[PDB]
Amino acid sequence: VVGGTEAQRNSWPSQISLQYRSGSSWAHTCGGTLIRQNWVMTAAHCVDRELTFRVVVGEHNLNQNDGTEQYVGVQKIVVHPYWNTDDVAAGYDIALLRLAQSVTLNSYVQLGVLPRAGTILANNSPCYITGWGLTRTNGQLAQTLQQAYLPTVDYAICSSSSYWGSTVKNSMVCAGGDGVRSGCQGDSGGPLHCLVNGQYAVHGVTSFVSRLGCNVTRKPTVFTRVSAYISWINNVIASN
Ligand SMILES: *S(=O)(=O)C(C)(C)C(=O)NCc1cn(Cc2ccc(Cl)cc2)nn1
Ligand code: NA
């Protein structure tokens, strides 16, 4: 997250860190959202490389023991069957990870609330991106979870020629684009939390940013629109 602020420890308890094994240790690669005690929602592109993954829930500072983390293996990966790693712009950038064990819920570990199927946010709706991704274009990961206020940019604006054009689809949510605040590498897979009827719900899964930089005017961060996939999510959970 570029242009973010450090999140309070208990603010976003559904946020997870998706990590892969690197030598004798682990490296953060993506965010995700805990949606059941044994299921995480992330981006399909986060699992394009065949690596050993783990999920960390209750995480705040990646480099330090917070006394709140639970570490769990990934037992099954279900990518959307229409996902094409060579065509991110086509959409379908969503995957479900079945965890090897059910995590325990507490003030630091809670299920993310998903939107009602079909919900589309009005332009300029209030949302926050969270993650440990880069804090500057070409920079380094955040040590502590960051948040940034990223109001939505509706489809008509986002898919217009001076924004993303045809690359953005109606199955995506755009947010931000103010040139200062944005998602960045390593936020992918994580949530966009949007305030609807007084409750925050996870309306986006971070999918891509501009090749030209993370915080670029009129290149808002682009997210998979969770409300386009409610039936798919429920079908996966019920059949696995
Ligand atoms: S996201 O918008 O943050 C973005 C820019 C697409 C991103 O940085 N995604 C992170 C990501 C994760 N993976 C899979 C991967 C590749 C290589 C290695 Cl060593 C581990 C994991 N690809 N992009
Ligand atoms: Na920690």
The CATH number that applies at residue 72 is 2.40.10.10
Same domain, yes or no: 102 and 160: no
CA 129, CA 149: separation in Å to the nearest integer? 7
**Which residues constitute the domain of residue 47?**
13-111+228-240
Same domain, yes or no: 98 and 133: no
Same domain, yes or no: 17 and 5: no
Distance linking the first and last C-alpha atoms of the chain: 33
Query: 146-149 and 152-153: which strand pairing?
Result: unpaired
- 28, 60, 80, 93: the active-site residue: 93
Contact 163, 155 (CB under 8 A): no
Same domain, yes or no: 220 and 118: yes
Query: Domain count of the chain?
Result: 2
Place of tokens 């629109």: 225
Ligand 1 centroid, distance to 198 Cα (angstroms): 32
Same domain, yes or no: 119 and 83: no
Query: 53-57 and 146-149: which strand pairing?
Result: unpaired
H helix intervals, the chain: 155-158, 230-239
CA 125 to chain centre: 18
Same domain, yes or no: 87 and 123: no
Same domain, yes or no: 135 and 99: no
Query: 150: which 2 tokens?
Result: 């990223």
* Closest among 76, 14, 37, 49 to 236, alpha carbons compared: 76
Same domain, yes or no: 121 and 23: no
Query: 205: which 2 tokens?
Result: 């899964």
Residue of 19, 22, 29 to test ligand 1 pocket, by largest number of atoms within 8 Å of CB: 29
Same domain, yes or no: 118 and 8: yes
E strand residue ranges, 39-159? 39-42, 53-57, 70-79, 95-99, 127-131, 146-149, 152-153
Same domain, yes or no: 142 and 116: yes
N residues, the chain: 240
Same domain, yes or no: 79 and 26: yes
Protein residue closest via CA to atom 14 of ligand 1: 46
Same domain, yes or no: 175 and 232: no
Ligand 1 atom having least distance to the Cα of 22: 19
CA 2, CA 205: separation in Å to the nearest integer? 17
Place of tokens 């040590």: 143
**Binding-site residues, ligand 1, Cβ < 6 A:** 20, 29-30, 45-46, 48-49, 51, 133, 183, 185-188, 206, 208-209
Contact 109, 34 (CB under 8 A): yes
